């Protein structure tokens, strides 16, 4: 449906593609460096939309591996 590069036409944003490439470069690094490159890879946060002003459901991220390779 969109018109762009191979990540953009698939619905993916650019930041997810570039972080997927960063994650796959990180997974093949040297062992004096791969463990400390796991520090810059963890995604731990949460979010919650707010529709009416204070109500909204929660969405929690616990990801130590990196960005989700699966669809957003």
């Amino acid at each position: 449906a969109p018109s762009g590069p191979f990540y953009r036409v698939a619905g993916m944003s650019y930041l997810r593609y570039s972080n997927i490439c960063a994650d796959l470069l990180r997974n093949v690094l040297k062992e004096p460096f791969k463990a400390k490159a796991q520090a810059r890879q963890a995604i731990h946060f949460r979010q919650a939309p707010y529709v009416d002003g204070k109500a909204g459901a929660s969405k929690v991220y616990e990801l130590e591996n990196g960005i989700p390779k699966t669809a957003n």
Partner: protein
């Protein structure tokens, strides 16, 4: 067409009318950069400032004389008074040279700009030195990356990026100097 000429100076002037007057002007990202694009100079012959950046590092900021950038059309090079460029980089080796000595950073991709004043800003996410990658896990992972081929074009586009980054990493690791 550009009828809202904003900036730090215009926001300073308009912001003194709607905010309470005791509040000091909020700072801007312009206030911590002494280097711009249209500000001519910063060239000085053969060596040019190479601002090789990273989200989690600053890998280089001193002046270098030639930079090999791995753009999406192919590897190109930047000498001193190069043409202005906004080049998207495919995963490849950014070569920083100061003479005979070359430091080879294999990056993950991400853009690299050349400005009119000759400053070059390589801007990539994961920018590893090619020393710290092993040659074993790349084909070990590409054997699996050549297997999971679904119709899911999200996962298939991730597989395309996977096989292309891994193939470029392989072709950069067998071809050492």
């Amino acid at each position: 067409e550009a009828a809202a000429p904003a900036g730090p100076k215009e926001f300073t002037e308009v912001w003194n009318k709607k905010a309470p007057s005791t509040l000091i002007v909020p700072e801007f990202p312009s206030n911590y950069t002494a280097v711009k694009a249209v500000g001519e100079g910063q060239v000085h012959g053969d060596a040019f400032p190479v601002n090789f950046y990273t989200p989690h590092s600053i890998l280089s900021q001193a002046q270098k004389d030639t930079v090999v950038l791995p753009g999406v059309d192919g590897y190109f090079g930047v000498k001193a008074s190069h043409v202005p460029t906004i080049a998207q980089l495919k995963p490849g080796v950014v070569e920083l040279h100061s003479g005979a000595e070359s430091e080879k950073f294999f990056v993950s991709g991400g853009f690299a700009f050349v400005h009119p004043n000759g400053v070059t800003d390589i801007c990539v996410l994961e920018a590893a030195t090619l020393d710290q990658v092993d040659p074993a896990a790349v084909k070990s992972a590409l054997a699996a990356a050549s297997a999971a081929q679904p119709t899911d074009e999200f996962e298939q586009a991730a597989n395309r990026a996977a096989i292309e980054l891994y193939s470029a990493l392989e072709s950069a690791v067998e071809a050492k100097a």
